[PDB]
Amino acid sequence: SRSQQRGLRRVRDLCRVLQLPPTFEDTAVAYYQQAYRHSGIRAARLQKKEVLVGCCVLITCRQHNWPLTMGAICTLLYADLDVFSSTYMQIVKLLGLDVPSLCLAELVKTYCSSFKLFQASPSVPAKYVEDKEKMLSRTMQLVELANETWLVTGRHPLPVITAATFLAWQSLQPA
Amino acid sequence: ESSGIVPQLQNIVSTVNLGCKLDLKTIALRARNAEYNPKRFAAVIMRIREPRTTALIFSSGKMVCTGAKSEEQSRLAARKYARVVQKLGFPAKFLDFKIQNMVGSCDVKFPIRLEGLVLTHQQFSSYEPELFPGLIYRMIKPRIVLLIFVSGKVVLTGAKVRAEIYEAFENIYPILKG
Amino acid sequence: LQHRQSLVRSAFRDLLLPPCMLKSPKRICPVPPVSTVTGDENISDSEIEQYLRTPQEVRDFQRAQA
Amino acid sequence: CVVEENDPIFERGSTTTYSSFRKNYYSKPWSNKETDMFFLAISMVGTDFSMIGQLFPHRARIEIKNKFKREEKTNGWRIDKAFQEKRPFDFDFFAHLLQKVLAEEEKRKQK
Numbered sequence: 001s002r003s004q005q006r007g008l009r010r011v012r013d014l015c016r017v018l019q020l021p022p023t024f025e026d027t028a029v030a031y032y033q034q035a036y037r038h039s040g041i042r043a044a045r046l047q048k049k050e051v052l053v054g055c056c057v058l059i060t061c062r063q064h065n066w067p068l069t070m071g072a073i074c075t076l077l078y079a080d081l082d083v084f085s086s087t088y089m090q091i092v093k094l095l096g097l098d099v100p101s102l103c104l105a106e107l108v109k110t111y112c113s114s115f116k117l118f119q120a121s122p123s124v125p126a127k128y129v130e131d132k133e134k135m136l137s138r139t140m141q142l143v144e145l146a147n148e149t150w151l152v153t154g155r156h157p158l159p160v161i162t163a164a165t166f167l168a169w170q171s172l173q174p175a
Numbered sequence: 176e177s178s179g180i181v182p183q184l185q186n187i188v189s190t191v192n193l194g195c196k197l198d199l200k201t202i203a204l205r206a207r208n209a210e211y212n213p214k215r216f217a218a219v220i221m222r223i224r225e226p227r228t229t230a231l232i233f234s235s236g237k238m239v240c241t242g243a244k245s246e247e248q249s250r251l252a253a254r255k256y257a258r259v260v261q262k263l264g265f266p267a268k269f270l271d272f273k274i275q276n277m278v279g280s281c282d283v284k285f286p287i288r289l290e291g292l293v294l295t296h297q298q299f300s301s302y303e304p305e306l307f308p309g310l311i312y313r314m315i316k317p318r319i320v321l322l323i324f325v326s327g328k329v330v331l332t333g334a335k336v337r338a339e340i341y342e343a344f345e346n347i348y349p350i351l352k353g
Numbered sequence: 354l355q356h357r358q359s360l361v362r363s364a365f366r367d368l369l370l371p372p373c374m375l376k377s378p379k380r381i382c383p384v385p386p387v388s389t390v391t392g393d394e395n396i397s398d399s400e401i402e403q404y405l406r407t408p409q410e411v412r413d414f415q416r417a418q419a
Numbered sequence: 420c421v422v423e424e425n426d427p428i429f430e431r432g433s434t435t436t437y438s439s440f441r442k443n444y445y446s447k448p449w450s451n452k453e454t455d456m457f458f459l460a461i462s463m464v465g466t467d468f469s470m471i472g473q474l475f476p477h478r479a480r481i482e483i484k485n486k487f488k489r490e491e492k493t494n495g496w497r498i499d500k501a502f503q504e505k506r507p508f509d510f511d512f513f514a515h516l517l518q519k520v521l522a523e524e525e526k527r528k529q530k
Contacts (some may be wrong), residue, residue: 069307071437081438087305092301099301101290114434141354149361150369153289154308154325158437183385204414207406207465222419222466223404224499226394227491244385251391262401282382305438326370339502403502404467413508415472 003049008032011053017076018068019063028060030075031097038094051079051087058088059097067106069158104152108143108161112136130172138168182281182331182340187243189274191253193236193260193267202232202263204284221256228252232260236267239275246274246337276332277339283327287351292323296350312347319343323351446482452523456516457486462501463508474513477521 011032015025032053035041041052061068070071074084092099112159116124118132146152152160176231199219202213210220221230226248232238238256253272260267277328289310293302302310309322309330318333319340329347334340406414449457464470466487472480490498 067358069435069437074438075431075436081440081441085440086305088303098297099291102305103301107231111435111491114432125382138354145354145357147362150286150325152304154304156305203467204411205406206404207410208404209406209468210468212469215394220466223400224495224502227495245389247389247391256396258395259401259404262398264377280382284381289369312362403505409507413465413510414470417473417508417510 004036007053010050011056014053014057014076018057020066024060024066027063028057031056031059034089035095040092040094047079047083048087050077051084052091053077054079054084055088055091058124059099062100062102063098065100065103067102067110069107071158102157104143104147104157104161105140106158107137108139108164109136111158111161112165115165127173128169130169135165135168135172138171139165142167142174151161178283178285178345180342180344180348182279184279184337184340186241186246186276186278187246187249187274188239188241188276188278189243189246189249189253189272190237190239191257191272192270193238193257193265194270195236195266195268197232197234197236197260197265197267199232199234200320202260202265205263221259223252223255223259225255226252229254231335232256244276249261249274277334277337277340278330279334280328280330281344281352283329283348284328285352286324286325287327289323289325292351314343314347317343318345321347446479446485448521449486456520457483458497458501459506461487461498462504463506465502476517 008029009027012025015028020028035052035056041048044052046069054073058068058070058073070084071081074081077084096158112132112135117129120126120129139161142160146160146164181198199211199213199217202219203209206221208222211218212224218231218233221232222228226243226245228240228242228249230238230240230252231239238253240249240253240256243252250272254269257267257269279300289302289304292312293310295302299315300310300312309324312321312323313319314321314331314333317335317339319331320333321343329344329351331340331343334343437477459475460471460474471483472478475483498530499500
């Protein structure tokens with residue numbers, strides 16, 4: 001079917017966009033071909049097939065303990081979070097594959113690597129620029145404190161990550 | 176060594192067939208508490224105040240009563256709906272009544288580590304905090320689908336009799352306590 | 354964060370829950386009064402009649418949705 | 420050609436983005452007199468939300484349904500009293516009351 005290969009080539013294109021290894025590409029295509037066997041997913045909506053691409057990529061990313069938030073996927077998948085989560089629950093209940101939990105440390109590192117407070121850029125002065133290693137270690141300690149004090153359980157993790165990195169950036173130079 | 180806590184059923188869902196065709200137009204016209212819009216939904220909504228239930232009556236005689244708190248209360252509500260349909264001018268009957276689903280709630284009164292629970296019973300659980308704050312456990316024995324919250328509250332669904340929910344909670348209590 | 358272990362230990366000695374639950378929850382999950390009064394099989398027809406729509410209300414609804 | 424009709428936006432950070440999950444609804448709350456006239460409309464019609472939404476232009480039918488469900492879940496005795504009491508359907512006086520409510524919300528906005 002052209003919808004299969006098409007959606008499949010879309011999976012591969014999203015893998016190439018995220019710059020994931022060919023092992024991740026292979027795992028994603030394998031999981032997509034495995035999920036395509038079900039009739040409820042086969043004869044589904046176009047948004048359904050797109051969210052299937054997204055969820056297969058997400059499961060492939062999770063299977064190797066790699067950090068990747070679902071919002072970043074939904075941003076480049078042309079979908080909405082409501083239908084995304086609905087179809088994700090449907091497909092996981094229809095398949096039953098292993099869903100490793102999103103490790104907090106890897107997500108903290110991936111989100112702190114996005115910040116630009118490491119190299120002195122024209123906009124940000126040198127005062128706001130801080131060290132990368134020390135700030136990342138402080139954010140890791142803070143998010144571990146939050147995970148051991150029942151702050152991340154039941155809530156979104158990324159807001160807590162942002163609060164922790166902000167507190168670390170302020171503590172490195174309160175004045 | 177019982178758990179010492181008893182769940183509380185909040186919704187009882189049961190389907191029942193009347194055995195005769197119905198005219199939803201007249202059913203909605205000759206009633207005050209009737210809610211029906213054929214372009215939006217092909218089911219008439221009936222609401223009474225004894226068990227505070229809601230009945231979704233269709234043209235084929237099938238009606239689903241939901242929102243009751245016990246099997247006997249659901250049966251009473253279904254019979255009252257059948258009597259209302261009869262008084263509306265239809266040969267409605269009370270046949271093929273059977274509890275389809277029952278939702279209950281309970282509390283354990285102590286926090287639960289959802290990450291530990293899902294690491295211990297991954298093959299029987301699913302935890303995605305980025306989507307829903309509650310961990311979704313699929314009970315081993317009956318079709319109990321449980322939503323467990325960090326605060327210690329657990330909602331159970333997918334049963335047919337109160338004893339199923341009771342024994343499911345009794346079996347899941349020591350797992351959450353340990 | 355230097356000695357956060359013992360500090361968090363003592364903090365829990367003296368459970369993090371949403372603010373809406375730590376407002377002194379004295380009556381946790383109040384027990385609802387069990388009401389299994391079923392009668393014989395029904396109650397009466399006065400409630401049936403009070404649920405049935407009157408001809409005046411029928412005509413008014415028809416005029417409104419004409 | 421676009422002759423400086425729009426302004427470029429420096430959005431969509433290539434690094435990453437998060438989710439919202441809440442986009443549109445953003446309802447508007449009720450008031451005491453509005454709840455009173457809503458209970459009046461309930462006692463006058465019933466549970467059919469179509470007629471209620473038709474007679475309420477400024478409030479959405481979905482919001483009316485949410486309010487009715489909230490009342491069914493919280494204040495049952497009030498719904499029972501509303502269904503016990505009955506009032507014949509009034510159209511002209513109801514439009515007059517609608518104009519009065521419009522004036523009242525205008526005064527509120529002025530305040």
